[PDB]
Amino acid sequence: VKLFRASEPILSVLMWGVNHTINELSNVPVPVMLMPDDFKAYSKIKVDNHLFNKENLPSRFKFKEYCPMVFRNLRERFGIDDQDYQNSVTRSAPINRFLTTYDRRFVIKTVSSEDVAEMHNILKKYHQFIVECHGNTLLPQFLGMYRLTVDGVETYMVVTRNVLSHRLTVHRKYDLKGSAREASDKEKAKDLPTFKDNDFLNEGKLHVGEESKKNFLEKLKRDVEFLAQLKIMDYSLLVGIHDVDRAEQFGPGEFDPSVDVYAMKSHESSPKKEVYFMAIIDILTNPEQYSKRFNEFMSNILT
Amino acid sequence: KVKLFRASEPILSVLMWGVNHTINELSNVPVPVMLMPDDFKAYSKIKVDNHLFNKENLPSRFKFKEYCPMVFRNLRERFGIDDQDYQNSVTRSAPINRFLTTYDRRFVIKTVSSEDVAEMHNILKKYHQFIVECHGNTLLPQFLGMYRLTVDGVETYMVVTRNVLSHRLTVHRKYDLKGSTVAREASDKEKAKDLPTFKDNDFLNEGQKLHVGEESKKNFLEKLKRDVEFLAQLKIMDYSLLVGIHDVDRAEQEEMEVEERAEDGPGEFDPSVDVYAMKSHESSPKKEVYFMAIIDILTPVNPEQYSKRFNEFMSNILT
Ligand SMILES: Nc1nc2c(ncn2[C@@H]2O[C@H](COP(=O)(O)O)[C@@H](O)[C@H]2O)c(=O)[nH]1
Ligand SMILES: Nc1nc2c(ncn2[C@@H]2O[C@H](COP(=O)(O)O)[C@@H](O)[C@H]2O)c(=O)[nH]1
Ligand SMILES: Nc1nc2c(ncn2[C@@H]2O[C@H](COP(=O)(O)O)[C@@H](O)[C@H]2O)c(=O)[nH]1
Ligand SMILES: Nc1nc2c(ncn2[C@@H]2O[C@H](COP(=O)(O)O)[C@@H](O)[C@H]2O)c(=O)[nH]1
Incomplete structure (x- = not known):
């Protein structure tokens, strides 16, 4: 019923x-x-x-x-x-x-x-x-x-x-366009803060092994090219960070890739233990310019 | 399951x-x-x-x-x-x-x-x-x-x-009855049809009776009594008693002929499904199944009168 x-x-x-x-x-x-x-x-x-x-x-x-x-x-x-x-x-x-x-x-x-x-x-x-x-x-x-x-x-x-997981809590989300953009004093208030280019770039950051670096970058390329060919623009790359340890305080870091489709394990030989979620969004609105600019700014967060 | x-x-x-x-x-x-x-x-x-x-x-x-x-x-x-x-x-x-x-x-x-x-x-x-x-x-x-x-x-x-009819058992003859002193017969056209809806004069003209047996007859007549009094209570008139007759032997034969053709339980039913169905008296000539119910009660020599005339007639339809 x-x-x-x-x-x-x-x-x-x-x-x-x-x-x-x-x-x-x-x-x-x-x-x-x-x-x-x-x-x-x-x-x-x-x-x-x-x-x-x-x-x-x-x-x-x-x-x-x-x-x-x-x-x-x-x-x-x-x-x-x-x-x-x-x-x-x-x-x-x-x-x-x-x-x-x-x-x-x-x-x-x-x-x-x-x-x-x-x-x-x-x-x-x-x-x-x-x-x-x-x-x-x-x-x-x-x-x-x-x-x-x-x-x-x-x-x-x-x-x-x-874009984000449906079970793994997110601890910090970013919104990247690859082009003056920080988060607002009012926006920095609540728990789920949405940062922009500056806050992340200035903050310092995403380790997803080469195998993941290649695919991802490869997928992002064809995508924004398509977007360009549509003469579309103004989109951002929503990025989620889930630090596993902070969650420990049915296991942690565990997810179903068929469901959390955008999720990505941190690399073995990396700093902290996290799961990243990353996808494009808001493409229902210089465009080719925008693409390469976008594409360039995103290639730089991937060790 | 589209x-x-x-x-x-x-x-x-x-x-x-x-x-x-x-x-x-x-x-x-x-x-x-x-x-x-x-x-x-x-x-x-x-x-x-x-x-x-x-x-x-x-x-x-x-x-x-x-x-x-x-x-x-x-x-x-x-x-x-x-x-x-x-x-x-x-x-x-x-x-x-x-x-x-x-x-x-x-x-x-x-x-x-x-x-x-x-x-x-x-x-x-x-x-x-x-x-x-x-x-x-x-x-x-x-x-x-x-x-x-x-x-x-x-x-x-x-x-x-x-x-009103069975969902499985064939009907081999049906009547529409009222009990109105006005002559009610089936048209020469209706008669030529495959399963004509006959009427009162026809039913009476044919000496037709329905042998259902005491217990059945009482339960039927008791239903009919409250039913038609209810109808009289409202302005309602001109309804009929649909009467369908199933011939058990005839069906068995028809069924048999049906397989022969195609190839190139009996007189029984579920009262929870064929709700208006009655078997004939163990003592009836033909083994038959009857289906009888009121129909056409959506229309408002009066109603009270009509109920009584309707009631008397039906109750005289059976034995
Ligand atoms: N959980 C979730 N939040 C989203 C998604 N897409 C956008 N958002 C939220 O919406 C905000 C971005 O604004 P938008 O571009 O959707 O108007 C971000 O702060 C983000 O928290 C999504 O797929 N999942
Ligand atoms: N091109 C196109 N636009 C549509 C279609 N249906 C709705 N839209 C657009 O979407 C908006 C919503 O239209 P509505 O559905 O409210 O009539 C309107 O701008 C309408 O022109 C369609 O079949 N083709
Ligand atoms: N099989 C079946 N026939 C019905 C039923 N009610 C009425 N009929 C038949 O369908 C035709 C239309 O019904 P009426 O218009 O007389 O109510 C009539 O000729 C009558 O014999 C019913 O419940 N079952
Ligand atoms: N008493 C009553 N009659 C209704 C009602 N709705 C429709 N009817 C009757 O049914 C007929 C069909 O109504 P319709 O649904 O076509 O507007 C109308 O002539 C009306 O008299 C209701 O709620 N109460």
């Missing part, structure tokens, strides 16, 4: 929506190939419930899924099972706009009308790129794009695979 | 889609201690606009409305019908024949007028309570769902009932 109990209607609608659409798709054959129309397609459901099932859901709401066939395919290409995805969203209200599913596997980010537009605009080339790199990429993994209507107000959402 | 909702008509795919959709949603809704007054004014409504998506069987654009869904779920429970079974009977394969049957012949789906839907609403409170206090023991139609489908901006109303 799914109640879709959530601290917010919007969330309940979200949960109801992912549930409804995944189920509906389970009735749609997996096609031999995507077609041009699949990139212009959507599903739209409008609910109007008089005196019925109001305990958690609004009586009236709308839910629109963009390009369901394309995103279902992406899901499979990223090695994600539809039923798992559905359960991640619906089993328990997602939590804290930038949300996470209760199990921390998927990030749910609110975006704007033009974000959704930019997404339509790159979706075919992004799909094609994912195919060609066999899913092996530091780019965001777009799992679904939705538009909710709750109380007459439209809200757009994009679901990605979480 | 469900394509494939069907000869788009109306049917939407029906399958709708029953499937509502039943699943209901499965996420707790089962209440009792029903609350509004449950009787309640409805669910979903509108679909798919674009360039999921178009092989469903239309891209349709509406589906379920009336008083908390009540009909409860009516299902009280009739010993599990929701998953109901769902399965409607969605596993297209209904077949405006008058449909589920592919497995358990449920009848009737296309009704707006008036009819209005009348289900008027009588719904009292019908439920009547079902509660008779524990589901009644010759009345057992209502399992009421729906409004919209395809092509055209609205179609449907009521689902339990089939």
Whole structure:
């Protein structure tokens, strides 16, 4: 029994929506190939419930899924099972706009009308790129794009695979663009601080053996090249640090690489014992300039 | 276990889609201690606009409305019908024949007028309570769902009932009876049909009787008595007693001929399933199975009068 109990209607609608659409798709054959129309397609459901099932859901709401066939395919290409995805969203209200599913596997980010537009605009080339790199990429993994209507107000959402681990606590996260950027006096307050270029560069730092250095750098190259060719820019490399010892005070440093896809063990002959999480993000907006600049600044944190 | 909702008509795919959709949603809704007054004014409504998506069987654009869904779920429970079974009977394969049957012949789906839907609403409170206090023991139609489908901006109303006929045993002759002094016979056209719906003069003209035996006859007549008094209580008139006759020997032979053809238990049924079914008296000529229930009670020389005339006639139908 799914109640879709959530601290917010919007969330309940979200949960109801992912549930409804995944189920509906389970009735749609997996096609031999995507077609041009699949990139212009959507599903739209409008609910109007008089005196019925109001305990958690609004009586009236709308839910629109963009390009369901394309995103279902992406899901499979990223090695994600539809039923798992559905359960991640619906089993328990997602939590804290930038949300996470209760199990921390998927990030749910609110975006704007033009974000959704930019997404339509790159979706075919992004799909094609994912195919060609066999899913092996530091780019965001777009799992679904939705538009909710709750109380007459439209809200757009994009679901990605979480960059950070879903079980290993992060102790320090960085946000790198490779180009005047430090963290703010107010931002430096809370526990989960988000540093920028300066704070890390000036701080001094990431040891992932050569084997990892090569792949990573190799993956980052083709990626930002693709981004450049899209005339896209303004993206950052989210970096997470999980120092194992600080965690010791079901084991530590232990993770499932099929789930924490961006995770990386520290090198044996290295200083401290850590797991790094690293991926690109926020690419829905000099570009070639930006790429090499970006690519250069990231090659330098890898002993 | 993909469900394509494939069907000869788009109306049917939407029906399958709708029953499937509502039943699943209901499965996420707790089962209440009792029903609350509004449950009787309640409805669910979903509108679909798919674009360039999921178009092989469903239309891209349709509406589906379920009336008083908390009540009909409860009516299902009280009739010993599990929701998953109901769902399965409607969605596993297209209904077949405006008058449909589920592919497995358990449920009848009737296309009704707006008036009819209005009348289900008027009588719904009292019908439920009547079902509660008779524990589901009644010759009345057992209502399992009421729906409004919209395809092509055209609205179609449907009521689902339990089939009066068996879902397996063949019927070899049926009657529609009222007991109205007005001559009721089957048309020369009806007669030429494969399984004509005969009527009173016909039944009487044929010396037809039904040998069910004492215990059966009493339980039947007792149901009929409260049933038609209930109907008289409401304005309700003009309903009929559907009478289907199954010939056991004839079936056995027909079955036999069926294998021979194809190749190129007996007179028995489950009372929990063929709910209106009675075996003939050990002392009847032919070994038969009868199916008898009230139908067409959705329409408001009077009612009280009608009940009495209806009651007397039926009770004289058997031995
Ligand atoms: N290119 C393209 N843009 C779309 C499509 N659907 C929605 N968008 C864009 O995304 C934004 C949201 O549109 P809405 O879905 O709210 O109608 C709008 O800017 C709209 O133009 C589409 O199929 N193709
Ligand atoms: N846990 C998690 N947080 C993220 C992810 N992507 C972005 N964030 C959070 O969002 C912030 C970056 O802002 P954004 O670029 O998302 O607007 C960072 O502080 C980071 O904590 C993700 O995949 N997982
Ligand atoms: N009594 C009653 N009648 C209704 C209700 N909803 C619809 N009806 C009746 O059923 C018919 C169909 O209503 P619709 O659902 O097409 O608006 C209408 O003629 C209306 O009289 C209700 O909540 N209560
Ligand atoms: N098999 C079956 N046939 C029915 C049932 N109710 C009515 N019928 C038949 O279907 C036709 C339409 O029913 P009516 O419109 O008279 O209620 C009638 O000719 C009647 O013989 C039922 O519950 N099961």
